[PDB]
Structure formats: structure tokens, C-alpha cells
Ligand SMILES: O=C(O)CNC(=O)C(=O)O
Ligand SMILES: [Mg+2]
Ligand code: NI
């Protein structure tokens with residue numbers, strides 16, 4: 001069995017190997033990459049996502065989210081308070097203000113320490129989940145707005161034709177902005193490209209051990225667990241590495257830098273934070289190996305998780321028994 005320790009693998013495809021996306025995902029899996037839950041892909045030196053970023057300040061963040069924490073430093077939840085719209089230019093200035101800027105620090109490790117120590121005492125503002133793309137239309141390789149769609153994968157594998165579309169989303173971050181512990185909708189893959197700016201630190205639990213994280217989360221957030229049998233679908237809970245190590249949960253960590261892709265694999269729980277102002281683009285995708293995970297994915301039916309239009313068909317076709325209850329929580 002390849003990668004039996006479930007380490008995060010880092011790949012350096014050549015320009016030739018960068019031509020066929022599906023093939024390269026399958027290659028990474030042949031090497032055991034999926035066992036980690038997360039992989040890093042460093043693009044060939046000849047590749048570029050776009051010519052320059054010189055013209056991004058006019059993008060609108062219609063609903064910036066202030067991430068307010070409750071709990072203790074290592075075990076907390078966050079809620080998103082909606083703020084008034086602002087442009088990327090405005091947001092970048094805000095990120096660089098004395099209130100919100102990255103503090104002095106020695107290296108990524110020192111900054112990680114300061115994040116876990118101090119996150120809960122501040123409420124950073126995140127421009128998340130903005131439909132759009134920053135890939136140039138002429139970028140042919142690993143262009144996240146030109147991937148094969150999940151609908152088309154399900155059609156090719158299973159023969160059924162469904163509604164729905166699959167488009168990318170932009171994420172504008174600042175110091176301390178946080179993504180809570182989650183897997184993807186329907187335990188899909190995700191791919192995330194860091195277009196510009198400061199790094200993003202990731203934590204991941206191997207898919208084969210995801211249920212260990214779920215059991216710990218039920219212990220640590222006991223009211224949330226009573227409210228919903230899939231409450232990590234709410235995307236609100238944070239658990240630090242120290243707490244994970246105290247409780248014997250297998251995990252790994254890695255820092256993504258601008259110009260780098262990350263792939264999360266089906267049922268790979270992940271969480272993380274941004275180091276300073278940055279912009280990422282991400283999208284879900286499927287492969288044939290995903291279908292069995294889609295069939296088994298937990299679902300929130302309490303009403304909190306509320307997701308996209310396209311998840312309907314996935315639930316309806318892959319999880320017909322659950323469909324009625326899940327849709328009640330959607331409506
Ligand atoms: O970048 C972020 O805030 C969160 N991204 C992801 O969870 C992902 O790409 O799957
Ligand atoms: Mg612009
Ligand atoms: Ni994710």
C-alpha cells in the first residue's frame with residue numbers, strides 16, 4: 001500500500017504532465033496521495049494562471065464576513081457576522097491596517113503559535129465564497145473554471161443526466177481568517193489555487209481516520225452534536241493541533257504559498273487559516289473513485305448547513321433514502 005503513514009505529498013509535474021488533469025489526479029492517487037486527505041501541487045515553472053493581478057481591486061465582496069469566536073483558544077466555534085459590501089481594494093487596505101495586519105513573527109511556526117494563542121481574541125473579516133474566477137481564459141492547464149463538471153462525471157459513470165452547474169469561488173483572506181473543520185459537500189474533492197498574497201496553513205485528517213475526528217468533535221461540542229448528527233457540515237468548529245495531539249487524532253499540517261495548488265480528497269477533513277492578505281480560488285470536482293464516497297456522505301438535515309442548488313441532484317440520485325429528510329432541512 002502506498003503512503004501508509006498518510007503523509008501529505010508534494011508533486012512537481014512537468015509541463016507535459018500538466019496537460020491532462022484527470023490523469024494527473026489518478027497518478028497522485030497511484031502514489032497514495034489521497035491517504036493524507038490533502039496534496040500540494042507545484043505547477044511547472046513555465047505555467048502561469050494569468051499575466052498579472054494588477055487589475056483586481058475592482059472585484060466586489062458583496063457580503064464580507066466578520067468571524068467571531070466563542071470558546072477557548074484550542075476549542076472554539078465561529079459565527080459569521082455580515083458586513084457591508086466592499087471592493088477588494090478596500091478589503092486589502094483593511095487587511096493591511098494596524099488592527100488587522102499580520103504581526104511581527106520569526107517564521108511560519110512562530111506565526112502558527114500566535115494564531116492558536118490569539119485567534120479567539122480578534123474577529124478578522126473574510127471575503128469568502130465569491131462566485132468567479134481569476135484564471136485567464138487562455139490558461140489551458142489546471143484552469144479551475146474549465147474543469148469537467150461533477151454532473152458530467154456522474155453522467156459518465158452512472159448514466160444519469162441531472163441539472164446543475166459547478167463553478168469556482170474566490171476567497172479573499174486576511175491574518176487570522178479561518179476555515180473550520182469540514183469535508184466537502186457530498187465528500188467531493190476540492191482544488192484550491194492561491195493566486196496571490198500571503199500563505200494559507202492547512203490541517204488535515206486522513207480519510208481513513210475521519211470518524212476519529214467526528215467522535216472527538218462530538219465530545220468537544222456536545223450541544224452541537226445533540227442538535228445535529230452531522231454538525232461539522234455547519235463549518236463552524238475549530239480544534240487546535242495541540243488538542244488533536246492530546247486526543248490522539250492523526251493529522252498533518254502544511255503551508256500553501258502563492259502559486260501553489262492544494263487538492264483535498266474525498267472525506268479528508270481539513271481546517272486552516274490565512275497569514276495575511278491573500279486571494280484563493282477553489283472548486284469542487286469528482287472522479288470515478290469519489291462515487292462511493294458520495295453515496296456514503298453524511299448529511300445535515302437540521303437546516304443549518306443550507307447548500308447549493310446542485311447538491312439536490314447528488315442527494316436525489318446517490319442517496320434516495322435520505323433525500324426527503326435532507327430536502328426538508330433545505331426548505
Ligand atoms: O480557502 C479556504 O478558506 C477554504 N478552502 C477549502 O476548504 C477548500 O479549498 O476546500
Ligand atoms: Mg477589478
Ligand atoms: Ni474545503
Ligand SMILES: [Zn+2]
Nearest residue numbers: 228300302304
Ligand atoms: Zn445540521
